[PDB]
A paper describes a structure:
Here cryo-electron microscopy analyses of human CE pre-B complex and B-like complexes reveal extensive structural similarities with their CI counterparts. The results indicate that the CE and CI spliceosome assembly pathways converge already at the pre-B stage. The molecular triggers and roles of B-specific proteins in these rearrangements are also identified.
The spatial organization of the tri-snRNP proteins in pre-BAMPPNP complexes was the same as in the CE pre-B protomers. Notably, in the presence of AMPPNP, U1 snRNP, presumably from the adjacent protomer, was now stably docked to the PRP28 helicase domain of the pre-B protomer, as evidenced by the improved resolution in this region of the pre-BAMPPNP complexes compared with pre-B complexes. Consistent with the absence of additional structural rearrangements in tri-snRNP components, the 5′ss of the adjacent protomer is not base paired to the U6 ACAGA box. Taken together, our data demonstrate that the tri-snRNP of a CE pre-B complex is capable of interacting in trans with a U1 snRNP bound to a 5′ss, which leads to the handover of this 5′ss from U1 to U6 by PRP28.
Numbering used by the authors:
A (entry chain M): 6 to 128
B (entry chain N): 539 to 587, 590 to 937
C (entry chain 4B): 164 to 522
D (entry chain J): 385 to 395, 412 to 427, 434 to 475, 536 to 605, 627 to 683
């Protein structure tokens, strides 16, 4: 993978992150795209920000952890956007899928658990 | 039936006029004697709508005994309108009917300290401390001893109040403010640390400790004290706002933005944190920050004052005046919002807007403000009026 | 299935020098332990109560911000000189403790810096113009740095994996480095080359630290097995087990028996060396315990950090929560006590570094 | 002690023999998201294929159609401290919580120190913490979580409401299952809360 992409999740961690991203996008709580993730990080309403390590170039998502250092949000980098290749109906693999807090989310606590799991990988 | 008549009199006072409402209030007062709440409501209706208010205060003092609030309102109406020694004689006559020195002795000490002959005020404070000692009476005696000069007797009274009322952080804060006005500053920091460790939750004592540790150099200890105050409450909005102000006062703008984001994530329903996030944001980014502050914290006086400051900074005087009017209608007791409204009236507008702002500041006394508490807690502007304090808060912006 | 492989003669010479430097050190440690055992229980209990009273009233002060990057590790200089911090950026500053003034920031890294631990005799008997501190980054680099030059030195290119931590030997001629290549390297200061690569774990080692006398060296990483390898010919017989998570912190006690290991399973394992078993499993915090620091030569406490905003200063032994050094705003990554024991720095993920001073 | 184990083993045992001892392991089929346009295409194709299959099965001449109308690899172990969890509703709920949530553990009671240790899965421990922290209303009697970590396997067999008037009996009962350090840390936290 890319050495600049940090942190790197495991297989089950990426599977749980993809399931949480699909549950957020199906319940209208996730935004795909780099500009939408940057706007969700600047607005302060994004609960989590996920990146993709298989990006050419990978520097375009390099501001995604740094904005996570500007809003106190967990950051994670899927080995490949292909994990979200279909994402929320996206034909092309998805990379920046800012998962924003959803009022009374049916998986709000589950998303919080993913956050708690994404804060321990960066050590 | 008396409560329904009082509600009808209040609705008549607020709906149309004041003659029939005062007649209904006089009929309810002469029909049957009520408690101090109806007398206070009649005194407020007489003060809001000179001679009639003094007559209502005399009727409440003659017909409703054991009413310290009505007697204090009558003494304040006599000192404001009639005379200061007549109000002192009225307070001395009300002290002969109510032997409790809780609020009558403090009001007499304040009336003797606002006028001349401070030895009589010191004797009244000593008599109140010898009759019924308390933390508020000791703090008032320490303030009356420290407003004249920083003598050793004021420091001894502050030490006695800190030894007798160590659970109360007001005596420790007064001792720290008395020691901070001297040449040394380590004694004030030690007194503030003792007040923060003896309360253990003291927000203004920890704020004064952070201000003393930041203003005297070595601001890393000030940041450590601010972190300990934020973790000792835990997650106080005032301590987070003080830490954000200390981070924004230095060159760490990204750390200040991260502290503001953490304060918004840990306490989104805070008007001071929303105002700090609106003031710390960029000029094209303030329109989204003010909208997010209005959506998260609606009908807030600090958010409305920040919106008024953003409208005045964007060369929109007609929007800043409307936002200041909305902030005065939402909360007229705010100090920072009234100071911003007076500054906007003095900067953009004629003398009529400044006169209306002065009348709004004189009708409702501003308190618990950002710029008002910085001038109301000092010893140099302790016995001053409300209009001069409002002018000093508007001129220092 | 422990397969053996022959090494160079320079590694055997360095092992013989380490044994000849550790055997009188172990004799002096045994003499000090016999002198402390001859002391009565009343004076020892009074000294332990005084140490507990000094550690309980430990207030955090001088929280000086290093940079915009969160601090990843911190190491106290010998003789209470300064404290070298290593943040998530390429700079490794050294703040003057307890003055909290940054001066002569040793930069030269590109990736996220790991553990920049100075030599045990850097400020004692080493020149400030020569190599005094050893820093590591997220890539493969173990760079030496001075204390008054602000420029790196010729690093060791024998590690091509993520070097998590690096710690110099107490003798000063060696330095261990825990890499992510399922091994731990041992570079030499006199030979200026890697002497050995002890692969005592199936996964990459995270924390590697030598003993107080320099005879043994504890390892630990993502393989959930702490290896205590001898510096003579390897043969790690004191294998530490029990932790179900990755060991991210290793701290050798000044006593010849106790050894502290910090893993991510919200516990700290104080294991014995004369019995090859785990003596205590102290639940110091609830988060992943990454940072851990042993006591000074008095040998009475242990400061274990975690991924929460606090750090537990527990007794050694006893495993009791005597002090909770809280006050940080992020994950406490990296912590080190001074040589005098009156000051201890605890780096956190809030881009700030404070010190616990006795009130 | 006279000397350490490594000092007695080395003292002559220094050689250039680099080895790799104790090569042991530390103690897949996954899907991805789909597309909305692909979802619509799949729904249309599936409905058409179902209709065609039904027509083929019921029109060929075989049957007339109707008229068209995991505790392993890491277990979450939590330990909470309550001032007076003796309440039967509270005590039974915690014990039953562990039982139903398979949170193998113990509930030890003492003089103003109630240590409730649960152990199981992460979702079961999260549900038990949400029940004991927000659902179970105690009130001076408050219940707070002392610690929450991960272990290799479960220590206790089933949730048993133990009872001990002294702290030494509860410490011996916790050391019989290997959880005396958690009870000692809970007692130290209770002593620090009562002292401060």
């Amino acid at each position: 993978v890319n050495p600049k992409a940090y942190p790197l999740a495991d297989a089950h961690l990426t599977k749980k992150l993809l399931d949480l991203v699909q549950q957020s996008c199906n319940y209208k709580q996730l935004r795909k795209g780099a500009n939408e993730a940057t706007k969700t990080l600047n607005r302060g309403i994004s609960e989590f920000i996920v990146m993709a390590a298989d990006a050419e170039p990978l520097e375009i998502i390099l501001h995604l952890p740094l904005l996570c250092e500007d809003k106190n949000v967990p950051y994670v980098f899927v080995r490949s956007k292909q994990a979200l290749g279909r994402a929320c109906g996206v034909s092309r693999p998805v990379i920046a899928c800012s998962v924003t807090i959803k009022e009374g989310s049916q998986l709000k606590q589950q998303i919080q658990s993913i956050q708690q799991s994404i804060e321990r990988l960066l050590v | 039936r008396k409560h329904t008549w009082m509600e009808d009199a209040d609705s008549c006072v607020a709906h149309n006029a004041l003659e029939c409402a005062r007649a209904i209030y006089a009929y309810a007062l002469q029909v049957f004697p009520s408690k101090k709440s109806v007398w206070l409501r009649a005194a407020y209706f007489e003060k809001n709508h000179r001679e009639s208010l003094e007559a209502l205060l005399q009727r409440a003092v003659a017909h409703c005994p054991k009413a310290e609030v009505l007697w204090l309102m009558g003494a304040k109406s006599k000192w404001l309108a009639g005379d200061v020694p007549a109000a002192r004689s009225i307070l001395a006559l009300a002290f002969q009917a109510n032997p409790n020195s809780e609020e009558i002795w403090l009001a007499a000490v304040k009336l003797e300290s606002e006028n001349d002959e401070y030895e009589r005020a010191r004797r009244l404070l000593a008599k109140a401390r010898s009759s019924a000692p308390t933390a508020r009476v000791f703090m008032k005696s320490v303030k009356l001893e420290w407003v004249q000069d920083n003598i050793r007797a004021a420091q001894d009274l502050c030490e006695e109040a800190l030894r007798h009322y160590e659970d109360f952080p007001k005596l420790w804060m007064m001792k720290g403010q008395i020691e901070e006005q001297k040449e040394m500053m380590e004694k004030a920091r030690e007194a503030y640390n003792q007040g923060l460790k003896k309360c253990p939750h003291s927000t203004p004592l920890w704020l004064l400790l952070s201000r003393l540790e930041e203003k005297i150099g070595q601001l890393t200890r000030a940041r450590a004290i601010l972190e300990k105050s934020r973790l000792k409450n835990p997650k106080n909005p005032g301590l987070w706002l003080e830490s954000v102000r200390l981070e924004y006062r230095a060159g760490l703008k990204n750390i200040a933005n991260t502290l503001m984001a953490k304060a918004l994530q840990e306490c989104p329903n805070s008007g001071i944190l929303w105002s700090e996030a609106i003031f710390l944001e960029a000029r094209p980014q303030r329109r989204t920050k003010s909208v997010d502050a209005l959506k998260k914290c609606e009908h807030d006086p600090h958010v409305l004052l920040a919106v008024a400051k953003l409208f005045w900074s964007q060369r929109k005087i007609t929007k800043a005046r409307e936002w200041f009017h909305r902030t005065v209608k939402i909360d007229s007791d705010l100090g920072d919002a009234w100071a911003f409204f007076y500054k906007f009236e003095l900067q953009h507008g004629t003398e009529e807007q400044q006169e209306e702002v002065r009348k709004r500041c004189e009708s409702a006394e501003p308190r618990h403000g950002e710029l008002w508490c910085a001038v109301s807690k000092d010893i140099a502007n302790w016995q001053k009026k409300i209009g001069d304090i409002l002018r000093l808060v508007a001129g220092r912006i | 299935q422990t397969w053996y492989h022959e090494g160079p003669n320079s590694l055997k010479v360095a092992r013989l020098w380490i044994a000849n430097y550790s055997l009188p050190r172990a004799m002096k440690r045994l003499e000090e332990a016999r002198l402390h055992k001859e002391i009565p229980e009343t004076t020892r209990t009074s000294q332990m109560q005084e140490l507990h009273k000094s550690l309980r009233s430990l207030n955090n002060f001088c929280s000086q911000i290093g940079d915009d990057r969160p601090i990843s590790y911190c190491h106290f200089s010998p003789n209470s000189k300064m404290l070298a911090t290593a943040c998530w950026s390429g700079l490794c500053k050294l703040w003057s403790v307890p003055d909290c003034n940054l001066l002569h920031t040793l930069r030269g890294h590109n990736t996220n810096v790991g553990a920049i631990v100075f030599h045990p005799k850097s400020t004692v008997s080493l020149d400030p113009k020569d190599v005094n501190l050893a820093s590591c980054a997220a890539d493969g680099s173990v760079k030496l740095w001075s204390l008054d030059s602000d420029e790196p030195v010729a690093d060791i290119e024998g590690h091509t994996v993520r070097v998590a931590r690096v710690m110099w030997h107490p003798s000063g001629r060696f330095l261990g480095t825990t890499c992510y290549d399922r091994s731990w390297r041992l570079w030499d200061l006199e030979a200026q080359e890697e002497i050995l690569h002890q692969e005592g774990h199936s996964m990459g080692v995270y924390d590697i630290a030598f003993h107080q006398d320099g005879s043994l060296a504890g390892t630990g990483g993502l393989d959930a097995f702490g290896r205590v390898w001898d510096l003579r010919t390897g043969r790690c017989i004191m294998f530490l087990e029990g932790h179900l998570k990755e060991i991210y912190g290793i701290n050798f006690s000044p006593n010849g028996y106790h050894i502290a290991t910090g893993s991510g399973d919200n516990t700290c394992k104080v294991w014995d060396l004369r019995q090859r078993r785990c003596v205590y499993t102290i639940p110091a915090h609830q988060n992943l315990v990454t940072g851990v620091k042993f006591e000074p030569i008095h040998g009475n406490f242990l400061l274990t950090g975690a991924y929460d905003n606090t750090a537990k200063i527990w007794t050694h032994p006893g495993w009791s929560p005597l002090k909770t050094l809280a006050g940080h705003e992020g994950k406490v990554m990296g912590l080190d006590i001074s040589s005098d024991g009156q000051l201890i720095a605890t780096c956190s993920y809030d881009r700030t570094f404070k010190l616990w001073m006795a009130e | 002690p006279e000397i350490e184990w490594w000092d007695s083993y080395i003292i002559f045992g220094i050689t250039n023999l680099v080895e790799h001892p104790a090569q042991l392991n530390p103690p897949v089929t996954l899907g991805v998201y789909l597309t909305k346009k692909e979802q619509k295409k799949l729904r249309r194709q599936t409905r058409r294929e179902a209709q065609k299959e039904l027509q083929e099965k019921v029109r060929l001449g075989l049957m007339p159609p109707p008229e068209p109308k995991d505790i392993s690899q890491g277990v979450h172990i939590s330990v909470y401290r309550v001032r007076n969890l003796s309440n039967p509703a509270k005590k039974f709920k915690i014990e039953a919580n562990a039982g139903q949530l398979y949170l193998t553990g113990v509930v030890v009671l003492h003089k103003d120190v109630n240590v409730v240790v649960v152990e199981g899965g992460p979702k079961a421990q999260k549900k038990f913490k949400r029940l004991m922290l927000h659902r179970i209303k105690w009130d001076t009697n408050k219940c707070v979580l002392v610690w929450e970590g991960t272990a290799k396997d479960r220590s206790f067999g089933e949730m048993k409401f133990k009872q001990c008037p002294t702290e030494n009996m509860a410490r011996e009962h916790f050391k019989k299952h290997g959880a005396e350090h958690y009870w000692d840390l809970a007692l130290s936290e209770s002593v620090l809360e009562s002292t401060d």
